[PDB]
Design an enzyme around this catalytic site. Structure first.
Site, short mmCIF file in Angstrom:
data_model
loop_
_atom_site.label_atom_id
_atom_site.label_comp_id
_atom_site.label_asym_id
_atom_site.label_seq_id
_atom_site.Cartn_x
_atom_site.Cartn_y
_atom_site.Cartn_z
N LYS A 22 -18.80 -4.35 -29.41
CA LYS A 22 -18.09 -5.48 -30.00
C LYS A 22 -19.06 -6.55 -30.46
CE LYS A 22 -13.91 -3.71 -29.45
NZ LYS A 22 -13.09 -3.40 -30.67
N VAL A 82 -11.72 8.03 -36.97
CA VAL A 82 -12.57 7.07 -37.71
C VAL A 82 -14.06 7.40 -37.67
CG1 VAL A 82 -10.93 5.07 -37.56
CG2 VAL A 82 -12.71 5.38 -35.74
N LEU A 134 -2.30 -3.32 -30.81
CA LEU A 134 -2.52 -4.38 -31.78
C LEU A 134 -2.33 -3.87 -33.21
CD1 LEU A 134 -5.59 -6.31 -30.29
CD2 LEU A 134 -3.12 -6.60 -29.82
N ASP A 176 -4.71 6.94 -37.60
CA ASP A 176 -4.88 7.14 -36.17
C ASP A 176 -5.06 8.64 -35.91
OD1 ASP A 176 -4.60 6.84 -33.20
OD2 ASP A 176 -3.69 4.86 -33.67
N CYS A 190 -8.44 -1.64 -36.01
CA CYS A 190 -8.03 -1.76 -34.60
C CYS A 190 -8.38 -0.53 -33.76
CB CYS A 190 -6.53 -2.06 -34.49
SG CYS A 190 -6.00 -3.61 -35.26
N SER A 248 -13.91 -8.59 -29.62
CA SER A 248 -13.38 -8.93 -28.30
C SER A 248 -14.15 -10.15 -27.84
CB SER A 248 -13.60 -7.77 -27.31
OG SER A 248 -13.38 -8.19 -25.96
N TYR A 287 -18.89 -1.48 -23.92
CA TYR A 287 -17.87 -2.11 -24.72
C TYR A 287 -18.42 -3.37 -25.38
CZ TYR A 287 -13.22 -3.96 -25.88
OH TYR A 287 -12.10 -4.44 -26.51
N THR A 331 -1.17 -4.63 -24.31
CA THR A 331 -1.01 -3.35 -24.99
C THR A 331 -1.18 -2.24 -23.95
OG1 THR A 331 -3.35 -2.99 -25.35
CG2 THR A 331 -2.18 -4.34 -26.99
N1 NAD Z 1 -5.66 -5.12 -25.59
C1 NAD Z 1 -6.67 -5.94 -25.35
O1 NAD Z 1 -6.66 -6.76 -24.27
C2 NAD Z 1 -7.85 -6.09 -26.24
C3 NAD Z 1 -8.71 -7.19 -26.09
C4 NAD Z 1 -9.79 -7.33 -26.97
C5 NAD Z 1 -10.00 -6.37 -27.93
N2 NAD Z 1 -9.17 -5.29 -28.02
C6 NAD Z 1 -9.44 -4.33 -29.10
O2 NAD Z 1 -8.30 -4.25 -29.94
C7 NAD Z 1 -8.26 -2.98 -30.58
C8 NAD Z 1 -6.89 -2.38 -30.37
O3 NAD Z 1 -6.74 -2.12 -28.97
P1 NAD Z 1 -5.30 -1.92 -28.34
O4 NAD Z 1 -5.18 -2.82 -27.18
O5 NAD Z 1 -4.29 -1.99 -29.44
O6 NAD Z 1 -5.45 -0.42 -27.79
P2 NAD Z 1 -4.50 0.86 -27.92
O7 NAD Z 1 -5.13 1.89 -27.06
O8 NAD Z 1 -3.08 0.52 -27.72
O9 NAD Z 1 -4.66 1.26 -29.45
C9 NAD Z 1 -5.88 1.79 -29.93
C10 NAD Z 1 -5.54 2.87 -30.94
O10 NAD Z 1 -6.80 3.32 -31.49
C11 NAD Z 1 -6.71 4.71 -31.67
N3 NAD Z 1 -8.01 5.37 -31.70
C12 NAD Z 1 -8.88 5.56 -30.64
N4 NAD Z 1 -9.96 6.27 -31.06
C13 NAD Z 1 -9.74 6.56 -32.39
C14 NAD Z 1 -10.48 7.27 -33.32
N5 NAD Z 1 -11.65 7.89 -33.04
N6 NAD Z 1 -9.97 7.38 -34.57
C15 NAD Z 1 -8.77 6.83 -34.91
N7 NAD Z 1 -8.01 6.12 -34.02
C16 NAD Z 1 -8.52 6.01 -32.78
C17 NAD Z 1 -5.86 5.19 -30.49
O11 NAD Z 1 -5.32 6.49 -30.67
C18 NAD Z 1 -4.81 4.08 -30.36
O12 NAD Z 1 -3.60 4.38 -31.05
C19 NAD Z 1 -9.40 -2.18 -29.98
O13 NAD Z 1 -10.54 -2.26 -30.84
C20 NAD Z 1 -9.71 -2.90 -28.67
O14 NAD Z 1 -11.03 -2.72 -28.26
C21 NAD Z 1 -8.07 -5.12 -27.22
#
Ligand code: NAD
Ligand code: NAD
Ligand code: NAD
Ligand code: NAD
Lengths: 248, 248, 255, 255
Positions: free
Chosen positions: C172, C65, C22, C41, C91, C155, C168, C203
C-alpha cells in the site's frame, strides 16, 4: 447526509473561496452566515444570496467579535451545524536577502500568524461550544469544522515563510482538535488548496487540469466533507497535482 | 566537517535539550552562546562549561533582546556559524470540554505560538544576517540553522492543539526558509523529538529503546546535522519509533 | 465556471474487486447514480451473481489483475458492452498477517507471502492502470480536456502499519508512492490519478476494532468509500493526492 | 546517560549493493572507522576486487537479494568469517525510466519492467531483512538491549516521483511504507529499523541534475550517505523513521 437545513458559519464569506462555499451551500438549501470584516462587501453579498444568508461583521482575531457573530447566527437560524474557516491573508517577504540587505520584519510574520492561525483557532474554540449545544444526530454527530490550509504547508516557496508557518500550524492542529472534539461528535477536517482563481503563468504550472482551480471546486469538496460521515482528522490537497517549485 | 572552532548560538541553552547540545559541542571544541531568559540558570551553566561558553540573556520573542544577544556573540567569538532553536514552552488544554463547560483561552494559544513559533522565526531572521557576513567555506556554506519541532506536529494528542499548531508551523516553514537562504549557503533543518528526559508510563510507550530519549541523543543528532553538508530542508523524527496515542 | 465533467451519469466504470466489499459498494452507488459498471474480479468470485442483481448497466468481467492477458480480455469485454471506459477503480486486494521474525516461535515471514501480497495489491493495480490508460488514451476528451480518471485503494497501513502488516504496508506504500508519478505521466493526456487510504471498514475482509476509531467510533460503511469515489470523479481539480478515509484513526502497534 | 552502543568500532555490517556506489562508500567509511564489512552483491559484480582493496576486515559474499538460498548462503559466510552480524544496510537496487503510457508513441510500460524493479528493490530488501533479523535475533543484546540495526535505502522518488518513475517510485514507496511495521515487529527483540531517502547522488547510477538542488547545488557525494549511515548506527534513539538526504531538492515532473 444532505446539506439541506444545515446552518453554516463561513469566515471570509464575503469573497473568494468562502463566498463560493456560501453560494453552493445556500443553493443546496443550507443557511449561511458570512463572517467577514466590516466593509468587506459582505452585506451586499448576503443580500444577493437571499433570505437564507446573512452577514455577521467580525474580525476573526477578536474574541468579542466572534462571540457577537455567533450570537447573531444563533438568533437568526437557531443553531450552528458547520463552520468553514476561509478568512486569511498573505505576504511575500524573504527571511533575509544578502544582495539587498533586507530582513523580514517581525510584524509581517506576526500579522499573518494572527489572522490565519490564531484567528482560525479562535473561531474553532468558540464555535465548538455552540455546536456542543446541538442534540447529536442518529450517528452521534453535533457538527463539522472545515479549515483552509494551503499546499504551502508542505512546499512553501521563496518568500512564503510566514504564510507557510501559518498554514503548517493549521495542518498540525487538525488531528489534536479532532481528537479533543471526538467525544462530542464534531468532525474536524482541512483542505489544502493549490492555486485558485479568487481575488497565465501560474495556470501553466498545474499538471491537469492545466488551469487555476475554480472556487466552485473548493465549495464542492467542502460539501463532500459535510456529507461523508467518516472523513475526520485529515488534510486533503485540492491542487491539480501541482507541486510548487522553489520560486524566486 | 568537524565542529571544532565553530561558534553556536543555542536558544534555550540553560536547560534540557539546549544545554545538552551546548555540553556536547563545547566538548567537541566549539564555542557556545547560551541564549536564555534572565534567571534561567544560564550564567551558572556557562561558568560550569568553561571559557568557550558564555550566557546571553534574552527573550526570543524580543527583537531588541535577540539583537543584543547576537551582538554579544559577535563581540566574544567574532562570528556565528550555527544556531540551534530549543527555547520553548508547553500547555495542556482542550479546545472545548462539554462535560465541564470549559473552553481553551485565546491567551494560552497566543502565548505558545509567540514563544515557540514566532520566537524561532525571530532568531532565524536575525541570525541569518549575522551568518551572511561570513565568507563562504570551500563548499559555499555560511551557516547551519537547526530548529526543534516535536512529533506533536504530526500526531498531537488531546490537549495539545496550541503546542501542535506551534510545532506544525516550525515544520511548515522549514522548507521555504531553506529555499530563501540557499543562495547564501545557510542550511535549515528541523528535529522532531518524541519523549525526552529533560525538565515510567511515558517510557513504556516507546517501542525501542523503551525509555525516554537521553538529551545527549538530541545533541548527537544536532552534531550529525552540522557535520553532514547535504542535510537540508528536512524534518527528522528522533523518537524510538513512537507514534502518539490520542490520550485523554 | 470552467467547463468540465461534474457528474457520474452516463459514465462507464471498470471496478476491480467489484464482486465484494468496497468495490461492490462502489458499483452499487455508481449504477444507482446512472453510470454503468464492469465488475472485474476472479472467476471463482460471485461477480456474475452480483452483476445480475445490479441489472442491465452492470456486467461481470472475469480476470486476475496479475495477468496481462486477463486484464486485456476484461477491458475488451468492457469496450464491447459499453464502449468508452471513463473511470477505473482499483479495489482488488488481499491481506496477510505475519511478523517479519518472531524470536519466541523461531518463525520467519515467508518470502512467498510477501511476494503474493505485492503481486496482487501493487503489481496488479499497476497492471490495470497501464492497460486502462491505453484504452482511455483513445477517448475523445471531455469538455474539460479529460479522457479518464483512475482511483486506487491504498490503506492507512501505508502510513502506520501494525505488527504483522509488513507485506500489506509495503504493497500500500507502493500505491501511495506511485500515485504522483503516474498522475504526472498521464497529465498531458488528461487522465487524473487519485488514491483513497481507508482505515477500518466493515467488509468481508473484517467490536474492539470499532472502539479504536475517534469519531465516529465504528467501522467505516462501504457506502462511505463509494461516496468518496463519486466525489473524486465529480471534482475536476482532485489529482495526484491520497485521501485518508478513516474517522481520524491512527493505528498503534498492536501485537 | 543511558547505556547503549554509540560506536561502529568492532561492529560487523552486511551491506547489500556493497560493490558500488552508496553501498561501497558505506563499506569504505565503516571499515575506516574500525568495523568489518561483508559486501553482498551479484556474482558478476566487482565485489571481490572491492573487498580485496578494503583489506582483511572486508569480504565479498556473492548473492542475488531476490533469492532466499543466496541470501542464506551470504549470511552463513558472514557468520563464518566475522561471527556476530550487528548491522545490515540495504543498498542493492536498480532503476528504469518508462512512462506508464505514451499516447504519441502508442507505448505502454511493460509488466516485466515493473515486476523486475519491484522484485529487486522492494522484495529483495524484505528478503534480506527477514533473514538478517533471524540472525540478529540470536545475538546477546548489547548494553542498551539492542541486537541489531537495519538501514534501508528508499529515495525522494517515494514522495515526488517524476515522469517515467512509476516503477521505481512504487518500489521505494514500499520501502517507506514497511519501515514502521518492521520496526514495530522487531522492537521486542531490540532491532532498530531506519530508512534513508537519498536525492541525487554521484554514483554509477548517475550538470543539469546538479543545478536543481537548492543548497549545496550539486550531486550528493556517496561519502555523505555513508556519514548518515554511521550517524544512525551511533544514535540509539533513531528508529522507525525515513530521513531525506537531498540538499532540500523537491523534484518537478520532468519529461
Ligand atoms: N476493508 C478494510 O478495512 C480495508 C481497509 C483499507 C484498505 N482496504 C483495501 O480495500 C480494497 C478492497 O478490500 P475489501 O475490504 O473490499 O475486500 P474484499 O475481500 O471484500 O474484496 C476484495 C475483492 O478483490 C478480489 N480480488 C482478490 N485478488 C484478486 C485478483 N488477483 N484479481 C482480481 N480480483 C481479486 C476478491 O475476489 C474480492 O472480491 C483492498 O485493496 C483492501 O486492501 C480495505
Ligand atoms: N486563492 C488561492 O489560490 C488560495 C490557495 C491556497 C489557500 N488559500 C486560502 O484560502 C482562504 C481564502 O482565500 P481567498 O483566495 O478566498 O481570499 P480572498 O481575499 O478572496 O478572501 C479572503 C476573505 O477573508 C477576509 N478576512 C481577512 N482577514 C480577516 C479577518 N481578520 N477577519 C475576518 N475576515 C477576514 C477578507 O475580508 C476576505 O473577504 C485563505 O485562508 C487563503 O489563505 C487560497
Ligand atoms: N523534552 C521533550 O520531551 C521534548 C519533546 C519534543 C520537543 N521538545 C522541544 O524541545 C525544546 C527544548 O525543550 P526542553 O525539554 O529542553 O525544555 P526545558 O524547559 O528544559 O528548556 C527550555 C528552555 O527554554 C527557555 N525559554 C523558554 N521561553 C523562552 C523565551 N521566551 N526566550 C528564551 N528562552 C526561553 C527556558 O528558560 C529553558 O531554559 C522545546 O522547543 C520543546 O518544545 C521537547
Ligand atoms: N545514486 C542515486 O542518485 C540514488 C538516489 C536515491 C536512491 N538511490 C538508491 O541507492 C541505492 C544504491 O544505488 P547506487 O547509486 O549506489 O547504485 P549502484 O548501481 O552504484 O549500486 C547498486 C548495487 O546494487 C547491486 N545490485 C543490483 N541488483 C542486485 C541484486 N539483485 N542482488 C544483489 N545486488 C544487486 C549492483 O550490482 C550494484 O553494485 C539503490 O537502492 C538506489 O535505488 C540512489
Amino acid at each position: 447526509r444532505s446539506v439541506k437545513g444545515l446552518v453554516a458559519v463561513i469566515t471570509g464569506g464575503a469573497s473568494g473561496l468562502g463566498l463560493a462555499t456560501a453560494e453552493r451551500l445556500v443553493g443546496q438549501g443550507a443557511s449561511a452566515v458570512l463572517l467577514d470584516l466590516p466593509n468587506s462587501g459582505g452585506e451586499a453579498q448576503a443580500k444577493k444570496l437571499g433570505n437564507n444568508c446573512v452577514f455577521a461583521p467580525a474580525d476573526v482575531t477578536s474574541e468579542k467579535d466572534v462571540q457577537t457573530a455567533l450570537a447573531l447566527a444563533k438568533g437568526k437560524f437557531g443553531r450552528v451545524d458547520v463552520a468553514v474557516n476561509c478568512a486569511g491573508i498573505a505576504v511575500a517577504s524573504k527571511t533575509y536577502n544578502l544582495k539587498k540587505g533586507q530582513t523580514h520584519t517581525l510584524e509581517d510574520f506576526q500579522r499573518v500568524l494572527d489572522v490565519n492561525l490564531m484567528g482560525t483557532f479562535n473561531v474553532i474554540r468558540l464555535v465548538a461550544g455552540e455546536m456542543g449545544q446541538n442534540e447529536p444526530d442518529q450517528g452521534g454527530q453535533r457538527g463539522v469544522i472545515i479549515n483552509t490550509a494551503s499546499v504551502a504547508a508542505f512546499e512553501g516557496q521563496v518568500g512564503q515563510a510566514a504564510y507557510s508557518a501559518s498554514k503548517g500550524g493549521i495542518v498540525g492542529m487538525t488531528l489534536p482538535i479532532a481528537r479533543d472534539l471526538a467525544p462530542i461528535g464534531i468532525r474536524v477536517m482541512t483542505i489544502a488548496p493549490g492555486l485558485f482563481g479568487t481575488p497565465n503563468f501560474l495556470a501553466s504550472q498545474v499538471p491537469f487540469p492545466s488551469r487555476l482551480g475554480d472556487p466552485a471546486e473548493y465549495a464542492h469538496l467542502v460539501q463532500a466533507i459535510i456529507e461523508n460521515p467518516f472523513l475526520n482528522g485529515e488534510v486533503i490537497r485540492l491542487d491539480g497535482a501541482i507541486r510548487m517549485q522553489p520560486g524566486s
